[PDB]
Scaffold this motif. Structure first.
Motif, PDB file in Angstrom:
ATOM      1  N   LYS A 176      10.637  -2.948   0.431  1.00  0.00           N
ATOM      2  CA  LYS A 176      10.857  -1.927  -0.580  1.00  0.00           C
ATOM      3  C   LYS A 176      11.579  -2.510  -1.790  1.00  0.00           C
ATOM      4  O   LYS A 176      11.259  -2.173  -2.933  1.00  0.00           O
ATOM      5  CB  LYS A 176      11.645  -0.751   0.002  1.00  0.00           C
ATOM      6  N   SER A 187       8.694  -3.440  -4.896  1.00  0.00           N
ATOM      7  CA  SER A 187       8.792  -2.458  -5.972  1.00  0.00           C
ATOM      8  C   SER A 187       9.032  -3.114  -7.331  1.00  0.00           C
ATOM      9  O   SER A 187       8.857  -2.459  -8.366  1.00  0.00           O
ATOM     10  CB  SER A 187       9.891  -1.444  -5.646  1.00  0.00           C
ATOM     11  N   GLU A 217       5.280  -7.958  -9.808  1.00  0.00           N
ATOM     12  CA  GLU A 217       4.343  -7.871 -10.910  1.00  0.00           C
ATOM     13  C   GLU A 217       3.322  -8.981 -10.742  1.00  0.00           C
ATOM     14  O   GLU A 217       3.670 -10.107 -10.380  1.00  0.00           O
ATOM     15  CB  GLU A 217       5.067  -7.964 -12.257  1.00  0.00           C
ATOM     16  N   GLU A 242       3.800  -0.898   1.631  1.00  0.00           N
ATOM     17  CA  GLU A 242       4.616  -1.051   0.433  1.00  0.00           C
ATOM     18  C   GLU A 242       3.813  -1.686  -0.696  1.00  0.00           C
ATOM     19  O   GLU A 242       3.900  -1.250  -1.845  1.00  0.00           O
ATOM     20  CB  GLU A 242       5.861  -1.873   0.752  1.00  0.00           C
ATOM     21  N   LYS A 269       1.422   0.868  -2.454  1.00  0.00           N
ATOM     22  CA  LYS A 269       1.953   1.791  -3.449  1.00  0.00           C
ATOM     23  C   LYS A 269       2.338   1.078  -4.733  1.00  0.00           C
ATOM     24  O   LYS A 269       2.259   1.676  -5.809  1.00  0.00           O
ATOM     25  CB  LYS A 269       3.159   2.555  -2.901  1.00  0.00           C
ATOM     26  N   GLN A 270       2.744  -0.189  -4.653  1.00  0.00           N
ATOM     27  CA  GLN A 270       3.024  -0.915  -5.882  1.00  0.00           C
ATOM     28  C   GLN A 270       1.745  -1.214  -6.653  1.00  0.00           C
ATOM     29  O   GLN A 270       1.747  -1.182  -7.889  1.00  0.00           O
ATOM     30  CB  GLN A 270       3.786  -2.202  -5.593  1.00  0.00           C
ATOM     31  N   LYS A 299      -1.014   0.601  -6.771  1.00  0.00           N
ATOM     32  CA  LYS A 299      -1.406   1.808  -7.485  1.00  0.00           C
ATOM     33  C   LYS A 299      -0.463   2.102  -8.645  1.00  0.00           C
ATOM     34  O   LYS A 299      -0.900   2.602  -9.688  1.00  0.00           O
ATOM     35  CB  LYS A 299      -1.470   2.995  -6.529  1.00  0.00           C
ATOM     36  N   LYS A 300       0.832   1.807  -8.490  1.00  0.00           N
ATOM     37  CA  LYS A 300       1.746   1.987  -9.616  1.00  0.00           C
ATOM     38  C   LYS A 300       1.316   1.129 -10.801  1.00  0.00           C
ATOM     39  O   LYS A 300       1.359   1.576 -11.953  1.00  0.00           O
ATOM     40  CB  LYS A 300       3.180   1.655  -9.198  1.00  0.00           C
ATOM     41  N   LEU A 301       0.859  -0.094 -10.534  1.00  0.00           N
ATOM     42  CA  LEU A 301       0.476  -1.003 -11.604  1.00  0.00           C
ATOM     43  C   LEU A 301      -0.934  -0.761 -12.134  1.00  0.00           C
ATOM     44  O   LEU A 301      -1.224  -1.160 -13.266  1.00  0.00           O
ATOM     45  CB  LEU A 301       0.594  -2.450 -11.123  1.00  0.00           C
TER      46      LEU A 301
END
Length: 129
Positions: free
Chosen positions: A25, A29, A32, A79, A82-83, A85-87
């Motif tokens: 996490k 998170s 990049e 984990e 979800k990162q 999809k965030k990016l």
């Protein structure tokens, strides 16, 4: 006692997973997708897993180590899912995708080269779903 060693086995398992879960996490998170590969966060996760396997090999049977590394593998995929999809990173043949794919091949090689883990089911394609 039988009944009771099983209860503590699951207790030490839960806590070994949580410790890794909060590592991921915290690292994923802030992950990049850029070269150089392997990424620093991937490497950090790799060194934690090399550290934890050798420490666990000393003191648990073969079958229990594999079960814990299954669970940590699941926790990492969730984990990373979800990162990504965030990016906005998707499996679309582009450089962002290839970078993620290099990091993950590096990771899976590390886990599979640990004694007793070489046959783990380490597929990741559902992180895009």
């Amino acid at each position: 006692l039988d009944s009771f060693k099983e209860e503590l086995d699951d207790y030490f398992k839960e806590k070994i997973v949580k410790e890794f879960e909060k590592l991921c996490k915290e690292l994923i998170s802030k992950y990049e997708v850029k070269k150089p590969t392997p990424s620093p966060e991937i490497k950090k996760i790799c060194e934690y897993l090399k550290k934890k396997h050798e420490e666990l090999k000393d003191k648990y049977p073969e079958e229990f180590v594999k079960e814990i590394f299954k669970k940590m593998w699941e926790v990492f995929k969730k984990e990373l899912s979800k990162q990504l999809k965030k990016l906005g990173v998707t499996n679309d043949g582009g450089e962002k995708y290839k970078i993620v794919k290099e990091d993950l091949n590096y990771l899976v090689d590390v886990i599979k080269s640990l004694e007793g883990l070489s046959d783990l089911d380490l597929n990741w394609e559902e992180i895009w779903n």
